[PDB]
Each structure stands twice: as structure tokens, then as C-alpha cells.
Amino acid sequence: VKPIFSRDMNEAKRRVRELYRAWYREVPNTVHLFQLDISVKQGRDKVREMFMKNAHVTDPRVVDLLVIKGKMELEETINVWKQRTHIMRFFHETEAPRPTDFLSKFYVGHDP
Amino acid sequence: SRGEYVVAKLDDLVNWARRSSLWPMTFGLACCAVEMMHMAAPRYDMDRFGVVFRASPRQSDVMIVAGTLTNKMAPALRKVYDQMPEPRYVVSMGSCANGGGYYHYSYSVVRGCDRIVPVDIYVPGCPPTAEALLYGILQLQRKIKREKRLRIWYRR
Amino acid sequence: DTRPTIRPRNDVVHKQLSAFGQYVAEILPKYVQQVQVSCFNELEIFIHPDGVIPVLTFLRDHTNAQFKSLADLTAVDVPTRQNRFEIVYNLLSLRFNSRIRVKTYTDELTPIESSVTVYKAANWYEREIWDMFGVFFANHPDLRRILTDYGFEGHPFRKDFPLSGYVELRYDDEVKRVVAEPVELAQEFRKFDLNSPWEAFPAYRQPP
Amino acid sequence: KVKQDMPPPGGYGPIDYKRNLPRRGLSGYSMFAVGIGTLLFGYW
Amino acid sequence: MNIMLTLLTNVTLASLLVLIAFWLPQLNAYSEKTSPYECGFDPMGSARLPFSMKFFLVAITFLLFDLEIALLLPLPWASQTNNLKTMLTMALFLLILLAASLAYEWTQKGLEWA
Amino acid sequence: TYKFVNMREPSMDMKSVTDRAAQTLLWTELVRGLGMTLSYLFREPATINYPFEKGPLSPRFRGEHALRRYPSGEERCIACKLCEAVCPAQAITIEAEPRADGSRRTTRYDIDMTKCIYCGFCQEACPVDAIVEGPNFEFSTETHEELLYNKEKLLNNGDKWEAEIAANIQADYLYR
Amino acid sequence: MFMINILSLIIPILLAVAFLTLVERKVLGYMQLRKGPNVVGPYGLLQPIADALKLFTKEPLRPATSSISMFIIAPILALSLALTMWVPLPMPYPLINMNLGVLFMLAMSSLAVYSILWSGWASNSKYALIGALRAVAQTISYEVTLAIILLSVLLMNGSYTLSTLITTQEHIWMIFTSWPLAMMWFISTLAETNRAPFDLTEGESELVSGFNVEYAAGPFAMFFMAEYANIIMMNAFTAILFLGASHDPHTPELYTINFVLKTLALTITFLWIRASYPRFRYDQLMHLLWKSFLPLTLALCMWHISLPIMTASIPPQS
Amino acid sequence: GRIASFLKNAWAKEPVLVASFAIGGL
Ligand code: SF4
Ligand code: SF4
Ligand code: SF4
């Protein structure tokens, strides 16, 4: 199939690393500009966590699309198009912890 | 007692000033904003009651949410409300701002501005007529008239 | 038929549109796959997805096709096809007072050449197609969210995207900000099964 | 009998639809002369 | 000393109005309310960043024009002299030079912005 | 079939040039606009003295909903549920059971005025003229919950505005 | 007794400003087919009191990014100078009789500008900074023309003493002698007070609220009062300068009334202009004031210097 | 000839400057 930006996973992994460097070097500015009440480590760990969620992906086309969406998210953060509400949406705080144990799920509700 | 009478009379003076010089901010989101303009139109003339449309939120007393409150707009509406100096009031105009209206089951519509800001008066309609919005504002003036803020302080 | 209830049919425009469709198909056989003229005199040309720029540039610059105005640019999600997304171009020819349609197809991954170089209006239309459906347009000057929320995830106009979405907003007093939470409805959207069990139009009966 | 809302027999009257911004004031010569005369009287 | 009294009274009245404004109402302040206003959204940059003047030349020349206005102020008393010929020639000379400076700035595209 | 706005060259006659210079220097058109708004000053204002004076309305006005009853006193609503089916905002919620008499009577008829689009499709679909958008438009509430009307709220509304609702139906039913 | 005179010149001016707010609202309404404030009090006469009580019972907010000292000093300077520019006005007798009251008025106006500047700068907001820069540009455009026109019209007065203006116009209004200067001075006063077609410092439709966008409750009320007091004072200056009034030394009330009526007419014309024209662009404002007025002001300054000498009509020094 | 054309053009495009130079000249 026709590629999007890369023809090999190695080429696709290169763009992921480039995005990570841009994201990693942006977190100190994001905390400073948005006046976040978190630490630089928390944001950088959060960036790592979101990258690690899409770690099982093997199709280079999907990898390119994820980086394309990754750059779009970074542009909003750099340009302060996002707000403190948008930035802190990754750090789910109002959401109560949902246990993943069967017995805990059994006690709560009919959730399969 | 003489103390209660002075406080009650002072409370009436404070309430009368606030309710008779309500300054809504120029904040309109959708179809309901057009009918809001018709309340400021010569036929109904909101300025006749002292209701004057100031622009900056810091120089306003009432926020009339007139239109659909989308998810993209919700943080902007809250911050603009928070920048209003107290005492501030919110009047929800139209079914879109009341409980989502026509777009209640929409992925990008907040189901009523009540989930973002506390609302004092709910004006029903799609859009509510210029009298219906005027009725709600005049109802807000009556609600302010029933505010015993100092009278409670004397009994705190 | 005739009489006031029916809509009159104009054969002259039908013949003209069919002739022009044959003309376009002859000029551009490399990309044109199918040509149709609907009974209400609307011409559709079906183009291989690689033919976006060539066919549109021809329909814009050709002396016998001055479709210099991009009326619309939308996508149709049919999840029953390999290429679910169907990109539709609506053109207007002020010189000949007629309109034409160009339809291509694309997957959830295969990109489409951006027609910004052909029509400058295609910019925001392609941005909206990307935002709503997920179709990526290569060589696009600025592709980003145009209609959805800034931190929105998912493409809503897809047929498999839920009507009410997955997340909802509200103001929390603890965090002093608007927070996104999983969608919970006080009343569920009552889905209605309205299709009648009897065939309505015998002229569109598909083979068994 | 049918009693729809219909135009009166013979139709309605003529409706003006063109601009009628009138011509007002004096010519430039007259206005300048009046101004200069007032200036001269004030000077004297 | 009467002018000093008037100035003192006006300043005291204004400051008393400020005091009543800042101490009569019920105050409830929090971080979001006191944040800068940027039409509902958060500002991108600081308001103390450079703000380019497209009419800088106009201001620098307004300096000299204010100077010339200062030079022209004594004219009502200057008409009371016996040397009306010299006084009139010098006043017209100053006005002609002011007009010439304005014309030079105008023709050399100085009054234009950017 | 088309008209040229602007596209009007000015005459360069010395009289015309002098008139234009007089307009530029003496601000003739500015005084013209000033006179226009001064004339508007001495007009009678179009304001109405609300709430003592109310704006004009028509029998077709779509306002607060109400469930009407037959002259006998019984509800017209026979729970056909097509008013709920036609409602484009899905504001109507209807549940019905065979009443003790065995008739088709709703047990729940709930309309959230906070979701309704005041389209009228409900009153136009009802085959027995039961649900009818009445003439009331000033029913603003201080809380959201008051706008979620029950069957009792609608029935009560119908009984209050019946006289007027009937009169409006009688005035307009020939057009429907 | 002098303190009583100070109070009798300040408090009535504040009441006049308060009721001028209502007068403006009602005039705009009736020129817009509307009715001004008509519910609060009979014919709306109690609206200003309600507005003042609301503003002074409203919570004032101190911006987090704002420099507190300047943010508080600006409103005080604005009101104090607005109340001070009435001290030398001859109605018919001035509270403080200065030989150079006119230059005092010019200096007091020049200082008042810093109120808008500091209020804008200290507000620490982009819109407020834009408003302050627009105020700077506005004062760049009108100040020279204002001073030149004032000098030219005072060349027939003999001195900068304001009281002498009454004598100079004892037989004829000075507008019959300098009506082009009268027009240009009127436009310059419109531009100076940040008023009709020149409301660029505030810019309601373009800058939300301009320099005072971050001001609320009391300070905002003080800026509004200062603005309207400057409006009335500048209209009074226009009245005394061109529309002279008869003064019978034994019945000063005659002048006072005539003066008041002329000032009221000029303020009503200010509102009239406010509800009749669109707003300038401050680039166009500066271009107008520098390229249509200033050349003409210089020419008329030459003319009004040469005229008394060429006609042997030099006014007396004393 | 040329003077008349210049003055007519001057008072048609920039009438403000024409008056100022005339008043200043006088
Ligand atoms: S309530 Fe109706 S008219 Fe008002 S904004 Fe919503 S959809 Fe538009
Ligand atoms: S109100 Fe009318 S349409 Fe609705 S369920 Fe009752 S009878 Fe049927
Ligand atoms: S007026 Fe329209 S939206 Fe409201 S209940 Fe009737 S059909 Fe539904």
C-alpha cells in the first residue's frame, strides 16, 4: 500500500523520536506558560505514558498518523491554543479510580 | 429594634441599586443572541429599565448565556464568568443553554450552562421571545429585590 | 408522468450533461472510472483517487470546462466498503452555467492529494474532512482541527462514532477548571426503528 | 366559496423602491460668500 | 495658597472615593477572577512585551512642534510693542518655518505610518 | 438585468468643484446626517410599556405546552405516542397502561421544556388536539428542575389556559 | 468661606456629571426611536443614583498582573484634574483668577492624559496597552492644533486671562470672527476628551473597553465621572471662548444662566454627534489632525496675527 | 493656462491646502 510519510518502521520510529524530543523539551515551557500546579517530571512522565500507550503499533502508516496527530497536539500547546483545562485533561483527576479486579467489579455493578 | 430597621432599610437601598442598574455583558452565542438584540431594540428597549449592555466582563453584573454552549466554548464561558466581579448573576436564555435543546444528544454540546456556571433565571424558548427574555430579566430584578444580604449579616 | 404533483423533467440538460460526461471521460480516461447523469440533471464523474489534482485542474482551466468555483467538498462514510470514505467535489462553472461532481475514495490510512493548489477554497474543506472523518490530505499547507474541541479525540462524522460521543464537560469546584468525564446521560437517546418492512420503490430493487 | 388571503382586485398600489436622497442646501459660492461676509462683519 | 487648597481638596476627595470603593463592598477574590482579560481565553504572551510604534517619526516631530507652540505662546504680549514691523516679520518667519518643516515631513513621507 | 452601484464619475465644472470643496470644508453631509438624527429625535419612540403593554401576537403563536380535555372533562390524550415520535428533540416521554375503565390513558407524559425546540410538530401530529402549544411565553423559572414538566404540570396548564387555547384553536383550525 | 466655595464648585459638578449620564442615555434613546431610563424614578431621574450605588457597592478587583500603585493613582489623577480644570472658569466670576488661566487649562489637560496612559500601562493587559498607545497617538494629533487654535482665538483677547473673554465679546460673539477656528477647536475638543468619532482610547466595539477594561466598581466610576466632567468643562470652555454672554455686574445670575444654557447646548451637540457618526480609525484621526487642520491652523494663526496689526485693532494688554 | 489647470486640480483634490496657502499668503 502507498505510504504516508515512511516506507519502513525504522523510518517511522525516527519521526516518533523527533516528536518525543519536541514534546520533552516543551514540557518545561508548558508548565511555566500555563501556570500548571504539577512538576516538570509529571508532565514528562505523562508524555512518556501517552507515547507508551501506542507502543504495540506495527503498521508504519498508523505510526505516521499518530505522529501527525502528535504534532497537531504539540502545536496547540506551543501556540497556547489549548488551555489549562485542555492540558490537565490528560491527568484525570475528577475521575474516580475504577478497579480492574474481578471481585471489585463484581461488588460495584454489572460492568463486564 | 432600631438596628434591624436601619439594616433592612440599607438592604433595600443596596438591593434597589443593584436590581435597577443591571449591566449584562455583550455575550451571545447563537440564535438566542438575535432575539437578545431585539430586547435592546426600540420596541422593548432594555436600556429603559436601566439594563445597559457593557462589553468587558469586569464592568458587568449579569451574564446572559444566549445560545448553545459547546464543549470548545465551555472553558471560555467559565473564565469570562469568573472575571465578573461579585455580585454577578447568570441568566440562561433558550433551551440550548438550559439543557442542550435541539442538540442535547450531541458529542460537542454541554447539556445546559448549569453544568458550567450557577444559573439564577432560566428563560425557556427556542428562541424565547424578546418579552420572554425581558420577563426573565424583570424576574431577576424581583429576585434581587428579595435579597436580604445585610439583614442576614445583622442576624449572623 | 404529468400534472402538477409530478416534477417536470428537462431532457435537454440531461443530454447536454451526458455529452459533457462522455467528453470528460474521453479526455481523461486514465482516472475517470464511471460517469452518471441523475434524472434531475446532475452530472457525476467518478475518479480514481490519484486523479484528484489532474481532473480538478482540467475542470478548472479547460476552455470547455470553466469550473472555477469550488461549490463544496465533503466526505461520505459508508463503512460497508473497503474505502469507506467517499470524497465528493462540487464544482460550479459560471461560464457555462452548470455544475459537476467528482467522487473519489480513500481508506482510513491512504492519504489524498490536497486540491489547495487547484482551488484555494479547498483548504478549510479538507481541514473539516480531516477533523470529521479522519481522512488525511497530503501536501496540505495547514492541516489541523477546525470544528472539534482542541483536545478532542476521535472523528465524529464517522458512521461508527457514537452520536453522544465518549466524553462530556462540566465545571469542578475542586480543580477550579472545566474537566472532561465519560459521558453519562440522564435520559438515553431513544433509538427508533422506523423502516417499513415493505419495499417502497421497485425501481431501486437490488438483485437477490 | 374559497376565501383565501388574496390581493385586492386590480392589485396593490405602487411601492417605491428607489433611492430618493434629496438635494438640499445652497451652492458652494453662496455658502462661502455667507461665511466670508460673517467674517468681515466680525472683523469690523 | 488658594490653588494649593483646591488641589488638596480635589486630591483628598478622589482618594476618599478610592478608599470607599475599596473598603465598602464585600470582597471575595480568587486567582481566576484577577487573571488578565483576553476575551475569555488565556493570553499567549505578556502585555509588557515591545509594542512597535508605526508613528514614531510623528511623535519625534510632535516634540519640535510643541517646542514651536511654546515659542508662539508669547505672541499676545508681543503685539503690544512699538516695533510692530519687526515683531510681525519675526512671527510670520516662525510660522513660515513651522509650515516649511511640516511640508518637508509631509513630502518626504514622514507623516505616513509603518 | 443588472445594476452598477458606484461607477459614477464626478463632473469637473468649476461650479461643481466649488460645491464639492464647500462640502469638504463646511462638512455639509455631516450636518445632513446630524439633521437626520435630529429629526429622529422628535419622532415618537416605538417603545411599549412592558409589562403593562404587551407586543402583538397571533392565534398560531407556539408557547408553553398544555394537555387539553374533552368538553366532558376527560383527557383527549389517547396515548398514540406519535407526538413523541415526531418530536425532533426527543423531549416527550410517554408511558401508557390500560386504565381502570380500559381506555388508552397515559401514565407518564413528560416533556422537558429545556430540550423542546418549540416547533409545534407535537400539536400538528396529535390526532385529537390533546397536546397544544398554548399562548403562554412568560413562564421563566429560577431552577432547571421546574422546566421538566410532568403530566400533572401539562394537565394543570391546559385547565388554566383552556379558555384561550380553545379560542385560538377555533380561530385557526380552518387553516390546519 | 473659600472652602465653601470649593465645595459649591465640586459637588454640583459631580451631580451634573451624574445627571449628564442619564441625559446622554435618554437623548441617544430618543434619537434611536427608544426611551432612555424611564423606570428608575420619575422619567429616570433616579438612574444615576442607582448606577453610583451599584458601582460603589460592587466588588473592585485588583488584577494579578497589575502594578497596584499606578493602577490606583491613575483614577485619582483623572478625577482630581477633571475637578481642578473648573477652578479658573469665569462664570461670571472665576473661583481662582489667574492671569494665565488658559495655559493652566492646557497644562491640566496634558497631565490628565497620563491617567489614561498609566491606567492602560498598569492594567497590564493587551487591550489596555493598545488603549494607552491610542491615547498617546490621540494626544500627539490634537495638542498642537489645540494650542495653535487657542492662541489664534486669544490674539483678539489681549491676554490669556479667561475673565477678559467676557469683555472681548461684549458686543459680538467671537465665533463671528473665527468660525473656522471654532469648527476646528470643536473637533479638537471632541478628539481630546476621547469622545464621538474619536472614542479610540475606549473603543467599545474594537477594544472591548479600552484602557479601562480591567477597571471595575469604584475606579471605573471615577474614570467615567472624570470623562464626563472633562466633557462639560471643555464645552464650558468652548462657550466662554466663542459664545460670549452678556454680564450685568449687578445681576451675575443673567450670565450664569446664559453660560449654563450654552454649555448644555454644546454637551447635547456632543451626544448628538455621538449618535450620528461612525468611529474614526486613529490612523485617520492623526492624518486628519496633521494634514487638514494643522496647515489650516497655521494659516489662520498667521491671519489672526496679521489682522489686528493691519486693521489697527490690537486688543489692550490689561 | 497651466496655472488655471493646476489651481482647478488643486481645489478639486486637496481643497484644504488651497485655502491655507491663500489665507497664509494674504
Ligand atoms: S434555544 Fe433554539 S434559538 Fe436558542 S440558540 Fe438554541 S437552537 Fe438557537
Ligand atoms: S398527546 Fe396526542 S399525539 Fe401525544 S400521545 Fe396523546 S393523543 Fe397521541
Ligand atoms: S414543540 Fe417540537 S420539540 Fe417541543 S415537544 Fe413539540 S414536537 Fe417536540
TrEMBL record, chain A:
It comes from the Eukaryota. GO terms for biological process: mitochondrial respiratory chain complex I assembly. Residues 19-76 form the Complex 1 LYR protein domain. Transmembrane segments: none annotated. It is found in: Mitochondrion inner membrane. GO terms for cellular component: mitochondrial inner membrane; respiratory chain complex I. Keywords: Electron transport, Membrane, Mitochondrion, Mitochondrion inner membrane, Respiratory chain, Transport. Signal peptide: none annotated. The keyword Magnesium does not apply. Accessory subunit of the mitochondrial membrane respiratory chain NADH dehydrogenase (Complex I), that is believed to be not involved in catalysis. Required for proper complex I assembly. Complex I functions in the transfer of electrons from NADH to the respiratory chain. The immediate electron acceptor for the enzyme is believed to be ubiquinone. Belongs to the complex I LYR family. Mammalian complex I is composed of 45 different subunits. This is NADH dehydrogenase [ubiquinone] 1 alpha subcomplex subunit 6. It comes from Sus scrofa. The lineage of its organism: Eukaryota, Metazoa, Chordata, Craniata, Vertebrata. The chain holds residues 43 to 154 of 154 of the full protein.
TrEMBL record, chain B:
It catalyses: a ubiquinone + NADH + 5 H(+)(in) = a ubiquinol + NAD(+) + 4 H(+)(out). This is NADH dehydrogenase [ubiquinone] iron-sulfur protein 7, mitochondrial. It comes from the Eukaryota. Keywords: 4Fe-4S, Iron, Iron-sulfur, Metal-binding, NAD, Nucleotide-binding. It comes from Sus scrofa. The keyword Nucleotide-binding applies. Residues 31-140 form the NADH:ubiquinone oxidoreductase-like 20kDa subunit domain. GO terms for molecular function: 4 iron, 4 sulfur cluster binding; metal ion binding; NADH dehydrogenase (ubiquinone) activity; quinone binding. Core subunit of respiratory chain NADH dehydrogenase (Complex I) which is composed of 45 different subunits. This is a component of the iron-sulfur (IP) fragment of the enzyme. NADPH binds at residue 156.
TrEMBL record, chain D:
It comes from the Eukaryota. The chain crosses the membrane at residues 26-44. It is found in: Mitochondrion inner membrane. Belongs to the complex I NDUFA13 subunit family. Accessory subunit of the mitochondrial membrane respiratory chain NADH dehydrogenase (Complex I), that is believed not to be involved in catalysis. Complex I functions in the transfer of electrons from NADH to the respiratory chain. The immediate electron acceptor for the enzyme is believed to be ubiquinone. Involved in the interferon/all-trans-retinoic acid (IFN/RA) induced cell death. This apoptotic activity is inhibited by interaction with viral IRF1. Prevents the transactivation of STAT3 target genes. Complex I functions in the transfer of electrons from NADH to the respiratory chain. Accessory subunit of the mitochondrial membrane respiratory chain NADH dehydrogenase (Complex I), that is believed not to be involved in catalysis. Complex I is composed of 45 different subunits. Interacts with CARD15, but not with CARD4. Interacts with STAT3, but not with STAT1, STAT2 and STAT5A. Interacts with OLFM4. This is NADH dehydrogenase [ubiquinone] 1 alpha subcomplex subunit 13. It comes from Sus scrofa (Pig). The gene is NDUFA13. The chain holds residues 5 to 48 of 144 of the full protein.
TrEMBL record, chain F:
Disulfide bonds join 83-126. One of its GO terms (biological process) is mitochondrial respiratory chain complex I assembly. The keyword DNA repair does not apply. It comes from the Eukaryota. One of its GO terms (cellular component) is mitochondrial inner membrane. Its EC number is 7.1.1.2. Core subunit of the mitochondrial membrane respiratory chain NADH dehydrogenase (Complex I) which catalyzes electron transfer from NADH through the respiratory chain, using ubiquinone as an electron acceptor. Essential for the catalytic activity and assembly of complex I. This is NADH dehydrogenase [ubiquinone] iron-sulfur protein 8, mitochondrial. The gene is NDUFS8. The chain holds residues 64 to 239 of 239 of the full protein.
